[PDB]
C-alpha cells in the first residue's frame with residue numbers, strides 16, 4: 001500500500017556544506033513500514049524560494065559566499081515531486097530522516113535554473129508542513145553470508161546508513177561489513193558518532209572516511225584521495241577474493257562510475273555490484 005502523510009519538519013540542519021538533514025515527524029505516532037535502502041517521495045506546490053532565505057550556519061557558509069550562492073532563486077509553476085532515500089533504518093520509528101543534497105546549478109553551467117525540489121526542501125524550516133508518500137523500494141541487501149562492502153559519497157550516506165543500521169541492530173547480522181565514505185574535507189563528515197558507536201558495538205563492522213581535499217584546519221591524519229583509490233589501495237588489492245563480496249554503493253555519478261570500473265577491473269561480477277543510482 002502507498003499512503004500519504006502530511007508531516008511536520010522537526011529540523012533541517014546542515015550536516016555538510018551542501019547537505020541538509022530533513023527530519024520529518026510522522027503524524028499520529030505512526031511509522032512508515034519501509035525497508036532499508038528504500039525511499040519515499042516529496043511533493044511540493046507552486047512556490048518561489050530565495051536562497052537568501054536558507055538557514056546556513058557560518059561553519060558551512062564559507063563556500064556559499066565565495067561562489068555567491070545566495071543569489072539564486074527558484075520559482076516553480078506546477079506541483080513537482082522527487083524521491084529521497086531514508087537515512088534512518090526501519091526500527092527508528094516515528095520519523096523520516098533524509099539527506100538532501102542541494103541541487104545548485106552545475107559548476108560547469110552555473111546560470112541554469114537551480115534544482116527545483118532540493119531548493120524547496122532547503123527552504124523548509126522547523127514547523128513547516130511536508131507532504132510525503134510511499135514507501136517505495138528498489139535497493140535492498142542480498143540475504144546471504146558474503147562480505148558486504150559499503151561505499152558512500154555525498155547524500156548517498158542516507159541509504160548506506162539505513163542499510164548498515166538495519167543489518168546490525170534489527171537483523172543482528174554477524175556478516176563482515178565495512179563502510180567507505182568519501183568526502184571533500186572534515187567539515188563535510190557527518191554521522192561520525194553514529195558509525196563509531198556501531199564499529200565499537202560490533203567486531204564484524206569497521207568503517208573509514210577519506211578526504212579528497214583535506215583542509216589545514218582539519219588537522220587530518222586519516223586516509224586521503226578518492227574513495228575508489230582508497231578502498232582499492234588499502235584493502236581490495238590485497239584481498240584474496242575481491243569477488244565473493246557484495247558491493248553496495250551510492251554517491252555522485254563520477255564516484256559511482258569510478259567505483260564500478262575499479263570493481264569490474266578486479267573481476268567482480270555485476271550480480272555482486274548493487275548501485276543505488278540517484279540519477280545525478
Ligand SMILES: Cc1cc2nc3c(=O)[nH]c(=O)nc-3n(C[C@H](O)[C@H](O)[C@H](O)COP(=O)(O)OP(=O)(O)OC[C@H]3O[C@@H](n4cnc5c(N)ncnc54)[C@H](O)[C@@H]3O)c2cc1C
Pocket residue numbers: 039082083084085086098099100101102103104105106109112113114115116117118119155158159277278279280
Ligand atoms: C530512488 C531515488 C532516490 C533518491 N534519493 C536521494 C537522496 O537521498 N538525497 C538526495 O539529495 N537526492 C536523492 N535523489 C535525487 C532527487 O530525487 C532529485 O533528483 C534531486 O534532489 C534534484 O532534484 P531537483 O528537482 O532539486 O533538481 P532538478 O530541478 O531536477 O534539476 C537537476 C539538476 O539539473 C540542473 N539543471 C536545471 N536546468 C538545467 C539546464 N537547462 N541545463 C543543464 N542543467 C540544468 C539543476 O541545476 C539541478 O542541479 C534520489 C532520486 C531517486 C530516483
